[PDB]
């Protein structure tokens, strides 16, 4: 079918890819008897939640009819969804930041750099496919622009989440490559005091058999701090790419006048219309996309000739880009 | 001063209390050479962020004047703030849930139960003081109801965050009390294989000197799982207390018709008004609180007698609870 399933299909494909990646990561973790990848899958559950939130928002936005609960339809839901995703991403970012700071004080050494690297390339391929999926992020008949803008907002929130996942995958790949080529781990009997993190066994195990012996150093100190710093950078990048969307979404949900419309010129043109003596309560806001609604309380003098004045005001609003207007004539006290 | 500082003062007092608690926790952590409490302070930074977000929302909502950027003023900001907080809390909840699941697979034993318990009572006192602070969670002149509702939404989002912190403090107190009275830790030389959590050090240290010796058990197995389960319960509770507010906020930002107003009866009364032949584009929504806006396209026949029809329609809207209406008369084609 093709009943406006352009965005729903992409979201469903991304959800399917995320589920396959999560299943593969869980299988790899249980094969190698590792729990870090299981925790990574439980973190990917957040991406799953973001995808299902966007899917719910799109499904509710498909219902554009004027029901009893909502008079404009559930169009803003899509916009709301984007905002939600943005805020969600922001929260995740802060969480990551917190973890990063912890990893700057009690650094953890990664285990099995080769398998972690392979999972990293798998996640990189999945996230690249995702980014390719979301590469694009009387009244006239131009609802196509409104649909494009709402879809752009929602798909852009999901794109921000996928870009965060892709940056995390790049960081994982870089960290695994560095750990495999630079860092030297210690398992049993290796003469390494671990001058890097404070070590529970590498102190007690070594001292019993390294009494003034030829002890060595575990590895480079800067390697263990590559995972936090990069993450921090990614967070910053994410925050940057998260600032517009959120803002825009918030503005759309704050009844903020769209930037393409100026109120001074609009009210000047409204007051310049013949038969109009006063304009008050001129409220202009954006429902979603190109659906801009402007309600004004026009003051007139001749009730008989109100039709021409209303037509001229509607023409002025059409010229200014507003096509869903409600004009109230407050005639003089006769 | 008293220039509408009823909520700003409470938010500032809560921020001050949170900062003193964070400073005390950091001092206690650095005195006892512990980093778990430092991580707890970095997590309290999330409460600080929620408080400053609510403060920003309240400050922007104080600007009720109709500026050029926003025609309704930044009133919805407060509502938006609540939504943000709710979503933020939701994110935190999910994060906690994830951590809880990790603590169900690789449980961590808590250290220094007495000092952790004391920090728990300190946090309990701070959160109880906070809950006491937020214990309360032609057109008529009743903006007091709108202010009350907007403040209730924002202060209720902050109250949800503070209640989450209070539940976390209760869980910390209970866990510390249980660990102090039930669990038995192991530091050096104690014959305890620790069957709860698999530690390579505790196994390697014992086997060299416990060859068929009188070894003992570390402690009860159910104790280490008290921290996750309780947390999970708290999460559920939080989610419950988070569902209404979020919903309400979302509805207010979705232009949803308030539950106190029915559209069938409203449109029936509008069509029953003498001189009205058709009512279309009757859009009713809630700006914030009691500020309900309803714009309709009334169809009339006599342009001269439109004043009485408009007065009757305004009276009908006043009876139905809507006081900011825009009525457009679409007169017959003459």
Numbering used by the authors:
A (entry chain B), B (entry chain A): 1 to 137, 228 to 424
How does the study describe this entry?
Among the ten hZnT members, hZnT1 is the only Zn2+ transporter predominantly located on the plasma membrane, mediating Zn2+ efflux from the cytosol to extracellular environments, to protect cells against Zn2+ toxicity. The overall structure of hZnT1 adopts a “mushroom”-shaped homodimeric architecture with the transmembrane domain (TMD) and cytosolic domain (CTD) of two protomers tightly packed. Each hZnT1 protomer comprises three parts: an extracellular domain (ECD), a TMD and a cytosolic CTD. The second part TMD of each hZnT1 protomer contains six transmembrane helices (TM1–6), forming a Zn2+ transport pathway.
